[PDB]
Design a protein around this ligand. Structure first.
Ligand SMILES: Nc1nc2c(ncn2[C@@H]2O[C@H](COP(=O)(O)OP(=O)(O)OP(=O)(O)O)[C@@H](O)[C@H]2O)c(=O)[nH]1
Lengths: 427, 50
């Protein structure tokens, strides 16, 4: 049987996986202590895709936690579900980050890659057959990119036959806090496109805008933001864990989503987001779901695909619906904007219907998108990289670590080579 | 003439059954009707407070 092992990297990913995991435990109805309370037969059955069974009916999460700063681990261990996570799975380092990409990629990783590889292969041999792996981290995250780029390279030759899902957050376009962050992102993405097959793009500014749009609660918590993305990541994973005539496996989806090899960056899309009075002012119907499902405001990933065109679109539907409403709704959407799709590929819509609703609503869905709206992102970072690399600011650290501008040359070039590739297909 | 009587007896009897039948799927389609629309609960509002 085919299962998944998760990887939790970077200090954001440390917050990402925590909320990501507790949702699943609450979804399957396990107590914080770990004693599962048998209530749903189906979730009792297909929990082995992610969790192993340990004694006393406790379901050990099959994730590995990695970092350098103990305070983050002490916090997450002290959380409501830190007891469910294994001290076996808490691998870390004795060093502070400096949030330097090179140190986590050349210096600190070297004496930690050995330990983490043993842990995962112990977990890999603990399981029977894998679809692959998924990673929670950030591309702009100083240390998470340090482990991520290294480990994905190592796991490539280790298991080049599995699903190497990646989940990273794009930093805020308006401000990056970290000033060497554009260096770190450019460094990471070069190996990312070289290595990964799947990548989710996430940005906080839209999340703040969504909070201003539907959450209408002034001051949220970053964990609430983590809940939103975890809800999305839950939705895409509800395919595998749940029955119903939907085709769930990722490369059943992936071959449907990617036209050409270097297309790994994909954008999410989610289903009803509702405000305080609209819960009792909304007639929850697939049309208004579909309308809301395809909203530029419902977008949250990077920026509006209104500026570009739509290469491939896939909406997975979770709940008690039928073939015809999604059949007519898709027929509705193509007739609305036929030109906004590329003439290159017609019928670029791929739909899945999960019949197992979430715990509280039935009419639900999720969207994964590949449009021509990523250009602005790295085009932005292009001026960032060129301007700072114009006068090599903050560079003596990397040379002190042992890094050269030569690595930067092909890194941006490979990035720029991707830019020409996106546009020349779509234009 | 007896056969003619039997034929219409069959026709009426079948007509008795289908009218009996016709009533249930009307109930059944109503069962279908109020089984799709959804409403979110407070379980979707508490977690965002944390
Ligand atoms: N945990 C957490 N991370 C955040 C938050 N907001 C933005 N981030 C960013 O998410 C990035 C990913 O974290 P990591 O990959 O663990 O970062 P790192 O490698 O230790 O390097 P740093 O940037 O110094 O943290 C960080 O660099 C932060 O800049 C937040 O609210 N919580």
């Amino acid at each position: 049987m085919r299962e998944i092992v998760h990887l939790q990297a970077g200090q954001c990913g440390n917050q990402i996986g925590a909320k990501f995991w507790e949702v699943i435990s609450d979804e399957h109805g396990i107590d914080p202590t770990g004693t599962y309370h048998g209530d749903s037969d189906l979730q009792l059955e297909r929990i082995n895709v992610y969790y192993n069974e340990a004694t006393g009916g406790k379901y050990v999460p099959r994730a590995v936690l990695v970092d350098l700063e103990p305070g983050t681990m002490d916090s997450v261990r002290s959380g409501p579900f830190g007891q469910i996570f294994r001290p076996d799975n808490f691998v870390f380092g004795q060093s502070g980050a400096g949030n330097n990409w090179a140190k986590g990629h050349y210096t600190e990783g070297a004496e930690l890659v050995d330990s983490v590889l043993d842990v995962v292969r112990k977990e890999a041999e603990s399981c029977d057959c894998l679809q692959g792996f998924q990673l929670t981290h950030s591309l702009g995250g100083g240390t998470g990119s340090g482990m991520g780029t290294l480990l994905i390279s190592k796991i490539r030759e280790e298991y080049p036959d599995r699903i190497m899902n990646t989940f990273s957050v794009v930093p805020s376009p308006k401000v990056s806090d970290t000033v060497v962050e554009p260096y770190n992102a450019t460094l990471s993405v070069h190996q990312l496109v070289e290595n990964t097959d799947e990548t989710y793009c996430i940005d906080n500014e839209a999340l703040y805008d969504i909070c201003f749009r539907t959450l209408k609660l002034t001051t949220p918590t970053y964990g609430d933001l983590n809940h939103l993305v975890s809800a999305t990541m839950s939705g895409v994973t509800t395919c595998l864990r749940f029955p119903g005539q939907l085709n769930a496996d990722l490369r059943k989806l992936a071959v449907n989503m990617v036209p050409f090899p270097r297309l790994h960056f994909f954008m999410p899309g989610f289903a009803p987001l509702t405000s305080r009075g609209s819960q009792q002012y909304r007639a929850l119907t697939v049309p208004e779901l579909t309308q809301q499902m395809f909203d530029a405001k419902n977008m949250m990933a990077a920026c509006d695909p209104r500026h570009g065109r739509y290469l491939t679109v896939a909406a997975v539907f979770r709940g008690r619906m039928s073939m015809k409403e999604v059949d007519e709704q898709m027929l509705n959407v193509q007739n609305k904007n036929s030109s906004y799709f590329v003439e290159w590929i017609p019928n670029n819509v791929k739909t899945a219907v999960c019949d197992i609703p979430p715990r509280g609503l039935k009419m639900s869905a999720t969207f994964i998108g590949n449009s021509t709206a990523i250009q602005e992102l790295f085009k932005r970072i292009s001026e960032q990289f060129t301007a700072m690399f114009r006068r090599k600011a903050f560079l003596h650290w990397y040379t002190g670590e042992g890094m050269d501008e030569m690595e930067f040359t092909e890194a941006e070039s490979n990035m720029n080579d991707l830019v020409s590739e996106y546009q020349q297909y779509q234009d | 003439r007896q056969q003619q009587r039997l034929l219409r007896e069959q026709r009426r009897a079948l007509d008795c059954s289908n009218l009996n039948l016709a009533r249930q799927q009307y109930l059944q389609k109503k069962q279908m009707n109020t089984a799709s629309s959804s409403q979110p609960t407070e379980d979707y509002f508490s977690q965002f407070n944390t």
